[PDB]
Amino acid sequence: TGRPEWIWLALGTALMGLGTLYFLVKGMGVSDPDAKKFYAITTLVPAIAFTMYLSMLLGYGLTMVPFGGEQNPIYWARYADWLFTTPLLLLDLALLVDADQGTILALVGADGIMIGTGLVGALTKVYSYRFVWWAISTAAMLYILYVLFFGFTSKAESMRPEVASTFKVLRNVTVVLWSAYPVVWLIGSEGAGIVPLNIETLLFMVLDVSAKVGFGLILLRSRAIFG
Amino acid sequence: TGRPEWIWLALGTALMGLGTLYFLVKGMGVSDPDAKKFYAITTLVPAIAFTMYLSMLLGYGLTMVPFGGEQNPIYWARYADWLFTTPLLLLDLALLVDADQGTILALVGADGIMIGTGLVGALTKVYSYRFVWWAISTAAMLYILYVLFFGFTSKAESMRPEVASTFKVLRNVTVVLWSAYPVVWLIGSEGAGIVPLNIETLLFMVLDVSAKVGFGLILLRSRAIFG
Amino acid sequence: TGRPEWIWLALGTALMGLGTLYFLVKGMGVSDPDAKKFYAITTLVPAIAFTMYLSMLLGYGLTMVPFGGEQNPIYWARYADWLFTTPLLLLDLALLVDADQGTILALVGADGIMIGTGLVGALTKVYSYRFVWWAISTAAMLYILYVLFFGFTSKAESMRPEVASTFKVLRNVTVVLWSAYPVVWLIGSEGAGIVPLNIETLLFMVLDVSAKVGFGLILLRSRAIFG
Ligand SMILES: CC(C)CCC[C@@H](C)CCC[C@@H](C)CCC[C@@H](C)CCOC[C@@H](CO[C@@H]1O[C@H](CO)[C@@H](O)[C@H](O)[C@H]1O[C@H]1O[C@H](CO[C@@H]2O[C@H](CO)[C@H](O)[C@H](O)[C@H]2O)[C@@H](O)[C@H](O)[C@@H]1O)OCC[C@H](C)CCC[C@H](C)CCC[C@H](C)CCCC(C)C
Ligand SMILES: CC(C)CCC[C@@H](C)CCC[C@@H](C)CCC[C@@H](C)CCOC[C@@H](CO[C@@H]1O[C@H](CO)[C@@H](O)[C@H](O)[C@H]1O[C@H]1O[C@H](CO[C@@H]2O[C@H](CO)[C@H](O)[C@H](O)[C@H]2O)[C@@H](O)[C@H](O)[C@@H]1O)OCC[C@H](C)CCC[C@H](C)CCC[C@H](C)CCCC(C)C
Numbered sequence: 001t002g003r004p005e006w007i008w009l010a011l012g013t014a015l016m017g018l019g020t021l022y023f024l025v026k027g028m029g030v031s032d033p034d035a036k037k038f039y040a041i042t043t044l045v046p047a048i049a050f051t052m053y054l055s056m057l058l059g060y061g062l063t064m065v066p067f068g069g070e071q072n073p074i075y076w077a078r079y080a081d082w083l084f085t086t087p088l089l090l091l092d093l094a095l096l097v098d099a100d101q102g103t104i105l106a107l108v109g110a111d112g113i114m115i116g117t118g119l120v121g122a123l124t125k126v127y128s129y130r131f132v133w134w135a136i137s138t139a140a141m142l143y144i145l146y147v148l149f150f151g152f153t154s155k156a157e158s159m160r161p162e163v164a165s166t167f168k169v170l171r172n173v174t175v176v177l178w179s180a181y182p183v184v185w186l187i188g189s190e191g192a193g194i195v196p197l198n199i200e201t202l203l204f205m206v207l208d209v210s211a212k213v214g215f216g217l218i219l220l221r222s223r224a225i226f227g
Numbered sequence: 228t229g230r231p232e233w234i235w236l237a238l239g240t241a242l243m244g245l246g247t248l249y250f251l252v253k254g255m256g257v258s259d260p261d262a263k264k265f266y267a268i269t270t271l272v273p274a275i276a277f278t279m280y281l282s283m284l285l286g287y288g289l290t291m292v293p294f295g296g297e298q299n300p301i302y303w304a305r306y307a308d309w310l311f312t313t314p315l316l317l318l319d320l321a322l323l324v325d326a327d328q329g330t331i332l333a334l335v336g337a338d339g340i341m342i343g344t345g346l347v348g349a350l351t352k353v354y355s356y357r358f359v360w361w362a363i364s365t366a367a368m369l370y371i372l373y374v375l376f377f378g379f380t381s382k383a384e385s386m387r388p389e390v391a392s393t394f395k396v397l398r399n400v401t402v403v404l405w406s407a408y409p410v411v412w413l414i415g416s417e418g419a420g421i422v423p424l425n426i427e428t429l430l431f432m433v434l435d436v437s438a439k440v441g442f443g444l445i446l447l448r449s450r451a452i453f454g
Numbered sequence: 455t456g457r458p459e460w461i462w463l464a465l466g467t468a469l470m471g472l473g474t475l476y477f478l479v480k481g482m483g484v485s486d487p488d489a490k491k492f493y494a495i496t497t498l499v500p501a502i503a504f505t506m507y508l509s510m511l512l513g514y515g516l517t518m519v520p521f522g523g524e525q526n527p528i529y530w531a532r533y534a535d536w537l538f539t540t541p542l543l544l545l546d547l548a549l550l551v552d553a554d555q556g557t558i559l560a561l562v563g564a565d566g567i568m569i570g571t572g573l574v575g576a577l578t579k580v581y582s583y584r585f586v587w588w589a590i591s592t593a594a595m596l597y598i599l600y601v602l603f604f605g606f607t608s609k610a611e612s613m614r615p616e617v618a619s620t621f622k623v624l625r626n627v628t629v630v631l632w633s634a635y636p637v638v639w640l641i642g643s644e645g646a647g648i649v650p651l652n653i654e655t656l657l658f659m660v661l662d663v664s665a666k667v668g669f670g671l672i673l674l675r676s677r678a679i680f681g
């Protein structure tokens with residue numbers, strides 16, 4: 001049962017596309033090899049979300065999972081998006097703060113586990129088992145946020161004020177936003193359906209656009225990205 | 228309806244396998260840590276194509292997608308191949324020219340979008356929607372080729388003549404070849420069926436073998452790969 | 455027909471989880487940026503296996519493939535695990551020995567081919583074709599082991615005794631273990647069913663736990679991981 005949410009899908013598609021476009025049109029002249037990296041990553045993010053929102057607006061990113069007492073529409077494309085998208089975001093933060101490869105690898109891996117585990121949960125037929133997965137995925141996330149908030153902040157304090165500041169903002173943004181997803185999941189049509197898929201998609205759209213475009217804007221608009 | 232094309236699949240399998248074998252038997256003695264990288268990448272390419280051509284010759288890489296007024300055989304394995312294969316190729320070019328990580332990341336990402344988007348298009352049931360995807364994927368490609376042709380060429384001009392020259396050839400080859408794929412797609416059984424899957428596969432075989440083995444030969448046969 | 459093996463799945467889940475937990479609780483204080491990398495990789499490994507063993511214990515990682523004269527339960531999750539897990543393991547060995555990027559790339563690629571090819575074999579409907587894939591995958595493996603045993607050993611001889619020693623042990627362990635998998639596959643319910651899926655899973659559990667936790671223990675317990 002997925003059609004009334006089309007409005008947010010289409011609006012999500014537009015925002016992602018324009019957000020991409022805008023970022024593209026801004027990274028052209030950039031010559032700094034460091035600023036360059038930030039534009040690539042930050043541009044790639046909305047670009048991926050674009051293709052996936054579009055896949056949902058066209059019905060491809062929509063699937064049917066049997067559980068509870070019916071056939072439930074699971075928008076799988078979200079994970080296909082988040083799988084490459086979340087780690088890309090983390091990467092931005094990693095470069096910005098100049099984290100160790102080991103911590104970068106540890107996060108990228110914790111992130112893939114988080115989205116991968118989330119996809120399993122979203123497709124699992126045993127209604128009760130869907131929450132075990134949600135539980136594993138959320139632990140994965142709290143680990144990621146734990147590092148971002150405590151480990152990275154410490155690494156940022158050693159950079160110049162501009163970088164420290166932009167990181168702080170960015171950090172606060174992603175942490176507050178990333179944790180909303182599990183709560184949305186838990187109350188949406190994929191978990192304990194308290195909110196209809198209609199509103200679910202809306203919350204996810206606002207969140208997504210904020211976690212990427214909004215995120216990107218904040219970052220790409222700082223001198224923090226330069227050496 | 229996929230069986231008369233078996234001949235090109237089998238021939239594609241043989242060429243990929245021997246192409247791999249030959250490359251393997253050539254990288255053995257190589258000690259230069261730089262030449263080493265080029266052999267790995269360039270060897271891995273046909274090796275992947277091998278497994279995928281074989282998957283098509285055995286019926287595994289073949290699927291059925293409903294669209295238009297019938298059930299259409301979509302060789303999905305092509306994308307499974309191209310997904311790892313195209314970026315690997317790009318990587319070769321990146322090392323050769325010594326491109327910035329940011330541009331390397333930007334291309335790898337543009338490439339994954341291109342093949343990923345292509346796979347969606349190839350599996351999309353709404354006949355008309357298949358061209359939207361083709362349209363997104365082709366834009367992705369033109370971006371990649373734009374950088375290769377203009378950005379990379381500039382980066383190569385700063386290398387020694389041997390490297391500049393080999394890049395030029397390589398560049399001209401991949402650009403001319405990579406753009407044939409969308410045209411083939413557009414006229415083949417996955418788009419506006421003007422050419423039968425039978426000939427489609429043939430064009431794809433010639434193209435593939437050229438874009439990899441041919442490509443590999445040109446490169447591995449130059450001193451351009453050495454420091 | 456997959457239920458009597460539940461016992462090994464559940465025990466596999468517990469061991470992977472605790473193995474992860476234990477490793478996590480050990481990498482906390484570690485400050486050395488090199489030791490850090492080893493903890494990330496080595497911790498991520500069992501963590502992945504955890505999620506996949508769990509997926510099998512809950513029925514999600516189980517699928518049905520038609521071949522021979524019946525419907526056969528294929529535990530696909532094993533490959534989803536091994537796909538990220540085997541290369542991670544290799545990576546540990548690569549860092550430990552400080553191998554060239556080209557050889558690291560060549561192995562990672564040979565490994566993905568090995569698991570990818572194995573997954574195809576495990577899902578291939580033409581009973582006879584399943585062994586062609588097994589044959590390709592095993593060649594892939596023998597290449598990996600060839601390098602580990604001969605190429606890496608040579609690279610390790612140039613490190614300090616502690617590192618050389620830990621590598622030797624590790625090397626001997628992975629080589630002896632990794633080769634058991636194809637033999638198990640060949641005699642298990644996925645190949646020439648001589649052993650029942652029940653015992654198959656047991657052998658795979660012992661193997662897995664050994665190839666990761668056991669492996670991890672040996673490594674993380676040496677000073678070899680420090681600069
Ligand atoms: C280069 C890297 C190193 C990249 C790696 C990429 C790869 C590994 C990503 C995997 C991502 C995962 C997370 C997504 C998988 C989720 C999975 C559960 C969902 C799978 O389904 C979708 C998949 C297959 O589609 C299908 O084709 C099969 C073969 O033909 C069919 O057998 C399936 O049935 C079919 O599924 C579809 O159709 C169903 C329709 O049913 C119909 O419903 C209507 C309703 O009105 C009606 O009832 C009809 O009667 C009924 O028949 C539908 O329900 C299903 O949902 C489905 O549509 O699709 C392939 C997706 C593709 C892989 C997405 C890619 C995403 C983007 C483009 C990625 C960009 C990534 C780059 C790589 C990032 C760069 C980063 C750098 C830093 C490295
Ligand atoms: C290590 C990395 C970091 C690696 C990441 C690897 C991963 C993410 C790659 C994903 C690649 C994507 C792009 C491919 C997905 C395309 C997707 C749409 C197609 C999916 O279908 C194929 C998939 C599943 O097969 C199936 O198993 C299910 C479970 O059992 C079944 O439910 C499905 O139905 C089944 O699909 C098959 O069977 C269908 C049969 O129907 C029958 O048709 C006959 C016709 O005569 C008759 O009518 C019968 O009656 C009828 O029943 C068939 O139609 C379907 O097409 C299908 O065969 O398969 C898994 C593929 C595997 C993942 C391919 C791997 C590719 C190679 C080996 C990769 C090498 C990569 C390394 C990693 C590169 C190294 C690079 C370094 C630089 C990093």
Ligand SMILES: CC(C)CCC[C@@H](C)CCC[C@@H](C)CCC[C@@H](C)CCOC[C@@H](CO[C@@H]1O[C@H](CO)[C@@H](O)[C@H](O)[C@H]1O[C@H]1O[C@H](CO[C@@H]2O[C@H](CO)[C@H](O)[C@H](O)[C@H]2O)[C@@H](O)[C@H](O)[C@@H]1O)OCC[C@H](C)CCC[C@H](C)CCC[C@H](C)CCCC(C)C
Pocket residue numbers: 063064065083084087105108109110112113116117119120123502505513514515516517518530533534535537538542573577
């Ligand atoms: C970030 C990177 C760069 C990461 C890339 C990740 C990605 C590419 C990995 C792909 C891995 C591949 C190897 C696994 C694919 C194997 C494939 C053949 C199996 C596919 O099936 C599973 C898949 C889809 O599930 C399904 O959803 C569809 C859509 O809704 C349905 O149409 C399918 O039918 C459904 O399949 C399920 O249900 C079947 C049920 O049938 C029922 O059986 C019961 C029996 O009692 C009864 O008869 C019922 O009546 C009947 O209906 C069942 O049989 C099927 O098996 C299946 O359950 O699932 C998605 C899996 C997800 C992708 C796994 C992720 C793994 C973990 C979490 C990865 C952690 C990775 C990080 C990235 C590593 C970090 C490393 C760093 C160094 C980079």
Ligand SMILES: *C/C=C(C)/C=C/C=C(C)/C=C/C1=C(C)CCCC1(C)C
Pocket residue numbers: 049082085086089114115118119121134135137138139141178179181182185208211212
């Ligand atoms: C652009 C998208 C962003 C920043 C997405 C972030 C997504 C998450 C933090 C998702 C988390 C989830 C859980 C913690 C558990 C349940 C399922 C998920 C995948 C929704």
Ligand SMILES: *C/C=C(C)/C=C/C=C(C)/C=C/C1=C(C)CCCC1(C)C
Pocket residue numbers: 276309312313316341342345346348361362364365366368405406408409412435438439
């Ligand atoms: C070895 C294989 C090579 C070099 C493959 C290259 C493939 C492409 C450039 C494919 C491009 C496509 C489009 C631009 C749109 C439609 C679908 C594709 C995936 C065929």
Ligand SMILES: *C/C=C(C)/C=C/C=C(C)/C=C/C1=C(C)CCCC1(C)C
Pocket residue numbers: 503536539540543568569572573575588589591592593595632633635636639662665666
């Ligand atoms: C933690 C898991 C480990 C170390 C797994 C190793 C797995 C292999 C070496 C698997 C090899 C296989 C073949 C060589 C051919 C047949 C199928 C496989 C995938 C089981």
